[PDB]
Please model this.
Amino acid sequence: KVQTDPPSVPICDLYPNGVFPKGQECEYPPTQDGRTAAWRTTSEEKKALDQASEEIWNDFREAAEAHRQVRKYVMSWIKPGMTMIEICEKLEDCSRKLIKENGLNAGLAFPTGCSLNNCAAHYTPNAGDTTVLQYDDICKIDFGTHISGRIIDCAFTVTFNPKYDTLLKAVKDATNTGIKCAGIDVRLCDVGEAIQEVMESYEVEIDGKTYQVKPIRNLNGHSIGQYRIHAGKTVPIVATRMEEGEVYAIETFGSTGKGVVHDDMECSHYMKNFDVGHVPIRLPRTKHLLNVINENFGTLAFCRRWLDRLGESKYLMALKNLCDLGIVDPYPPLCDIKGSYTAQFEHTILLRPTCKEVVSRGDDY
Ligand SMILES: CC(C)Oc1cc(N2CCNCC2)ccc1-c1c(C(N)=O)[nH]c2cc(F)c(Cl)cc12
Ligand SMILES: [Mn+2]
Ligand SMILES: [Mn+2]
Model:
């Protein structure tokens, strides 16, 4: 079976034997005295440990292949004039089809981020949002797919005006640097230090004004767990080590502002607190909403549009109650200072026993 234009054929139909394309495979970086970790590629113990988890790597690969094909389609049509709603809906429709959405077993890991300009992350339009993408907008397209809770967290930046070209190059270079420096036993702060050094080596000129690119210091890479976008380990931009079999989202954000984000605009993103156990609720609308969240999202993220599409209404008080109780957490848009510009690049990497796999790498980024 071959992929259509626009893509509509599910990834598992293009690979009937259920063996999915590998991402970019890298030898681990050498240590401090220059002693390589190349031995991992040829170690018989490492190869058996790697094959024991083949089903897992395979679920990430299917999810990454859906991500590559969805984002390639998005890049062909994304244009100024389109509303943010139209963009998110058109992307998500393709995403659901290619991942072959099936409850909590296959689907969308989190809402389509499409944060604009000074806003770096966690903006997706709510119903009634009339925001239209502009020619001068710098749009961060951040969307996730998953197979059995093996999440692909991968993002890029869309622009139409070439004035942002050197800002995108800085961030792409800083993300690629973090990915190169990542490895088994590598300290998280060393990855962060390498990211910062490359990011700050760039100076950009946008509309007659110059800036030394700043990494957003409170927006960081992170470990990924099953049905858990952020598994608790962070890649900080400045003791904890990356470990074998761990999965990371290596993301960087460059800014012309303060290089610090703050909560701004109305909330659209939400996610159940991963650690919260069963909570008995009698309040009818609050009980019903939590049952909708548990059935459709579990510990995966969602947005208000995803509640609207399920036929839910008059849920705002019910959602505020879940947030007040600490069952669900709101994740509002994260914005740098007014008038600033932010860019982002992100990949998902598998720290396999034999090698580092940039599973979401494409021919695009
Ligand atoms: C930038 C911060 C605010 O992001 C997070 C922090 C936590 N924290 C849990 C509590 N402990 C601190 C970390 C958990 C998840 C995310 C997150 C990410 C991600 N980091 O890439 N992407 C997301 C997509 C979404 F739709 C939603 Cl709702 C949440 C996320
Ligand atoms: Mn992301
Ligand atoms: Mn992330």
Observations:
- The first strand starts at residue 24 and ends at 26.
- The pocket of manganese (II) ion (ligand 3) is lined by residues 153, 222, 249, 251, 346 (CB under 6 Å).
- DSSP finds ten helices and 18 strands in the chain.
- The longest helix spans residues 54-77.
